[PDB]
């Protein structure tokens, strides 16, 4: 639980839903994936 | 030749420079004789005439006739019926093009326009057949992908396509060998390599056991060992 995760979520929350400027919608909750790996072995991609 | 093969029972050979010259000379006389030479400007008795020549040099129990036949290609295309008909009476071709001469590879023999009815998986054995099969296939992918490779560079394409491109380039330079009588012209010493050696040298290359080392290591060398040494010569 990073400091920037906390501010991010506080931000995302002020933005709600789509009735906000475009930049706002882009800085929060647009899909993407991040595939973790280890060391190889890999935790399966889950939503951004 | 026939006198040698039959009566005397000798093992014979024949080499001809050039057999195309038989059709051409014959075509001049064809009009005069009483024949209409239409077949893209050739005698209509082509089949019958090439047939008698190439069947009088056909293997007998009295003596086997190894032929080497030399074909002048009319206006650099093999499509006309007279270059085509030669392929009909042959069991091997090792076609040499203009293009491989320009690329600076001597000999100028095409790898993908070579044939034998001598290559099978137990005629020359399992290793020879596997090794030839990977070579033909690799090379055919590299020409097929030449529009795409050239138009869009080779740090923009896939992992698989770059690995082929580097392998095929290495085989391309490898095909260069100066011969015992060609050594003069290139200025690179003659290289005489065995068939048994060739299978080995290529099996190793195909498995990528010498593709971590210059493509010019393989320029104008014989077999694998000749390649290895020249890389160190090139390095220093």
């Amino acid at each position: 639980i990073s400091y920037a995760a906390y501010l991010n979520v506080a931000a995302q929350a002020i933005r709600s839903t789509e009735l906000q400027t475009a930049s706002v919608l882009n800085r929060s909750q647009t899909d993407a994936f991040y595939t973790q790996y280890k060391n190889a072995s890999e935790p399966t991609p889950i939503t951004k | 030749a026939e006198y040698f093969r039959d009566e005397e029972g000798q093992d014979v050979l024949l080499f001809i420079d050039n057999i195309f010259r038989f059709t051409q000379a014959g075509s001049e006389v064809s009009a005069l004789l009483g024949r209409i030479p239409s077949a893209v400007g050739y005698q209509p008795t082509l089949a019958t005439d090439m047939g008698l020549l190439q069947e009088r040099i056909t293997t007998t129990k009295k003596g086997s006739v190894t032929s080497v036949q030399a074909v002048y290609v009319p206006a650099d295309d093999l499509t006309d019926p007279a270059p085509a008909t030669t392929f009909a009476h042959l069991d091997a071709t090792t076609v040499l093009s203009r293009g491989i001469s320009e690329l600076g590879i001597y000999p100028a023999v095409d790898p993908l326009d070579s044939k034998s009815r001598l290559l099978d998986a137990a005629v020359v054995g399992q290793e020879h057949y596997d090794v030839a099969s990977k070579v033909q296939e690799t090379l055919q992918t590299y020409k097929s992908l030449q529009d795409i490779i050239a138009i869009l560079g080779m740090d923009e394409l896939s992992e698989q396509d770059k690995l082929t491109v580097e392998r095929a380039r290495k085989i391309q330079r490898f095909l260069s060998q100066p011969f015992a009588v060609a050594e003069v012209f290139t200025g690179i010493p003659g290289k005489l390599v065995r068939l048994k050696d060739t299978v080995a040298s290529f099996k190793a290359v195909l498995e990528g056991k010498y593709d971590n080392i210059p493509e010019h290591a393989f320029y104008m060398v014989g077999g694998i060992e000749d390649v290895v040494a020249k890389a160190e010569k090139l390095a220093a």
Binding site: - | R35, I36, S38, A39, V40, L46, A47, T48, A84
Partner: protein, 85 residues
């Protein structure tokens, strides 16, 4: 091939090369001063092949239980298919 088919027994005919029949017949036609069609090949080459090919066929068992089946083979020049033969 037909003799087998006639008595009641099936057969199959592989024709390598029909392409060479056409080379041979070209020689014949042009030294017999019979007009050509396209590419110096005879006027009525197709008629010689066509009748020939339809003698492979399945007949009815009342009139011979056999069939001759045919596979002609044409060895093409530069993989070409827009020429007459």
């Amino acid at each position: 091939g037909e003799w087998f088919r006639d008595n009641g027994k099936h057969a199959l005919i592989v024709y390598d090369d029909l392409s060479k029949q056409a080379v041979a017949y070209r020689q014949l036609s042009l030294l017999l001063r019979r007009p050509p069609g396209r590419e110096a090949y005879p006027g009525d080459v197709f008629y010689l092949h066509s009748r020939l090919l339809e003698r492979a066929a399945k007949l009815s068992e009342k009139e011979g239980s056999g069939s001759l089946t045919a596979l002609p083979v044409i060895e093409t020049q530069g993989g070409d298919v827009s020429a007459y033969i």
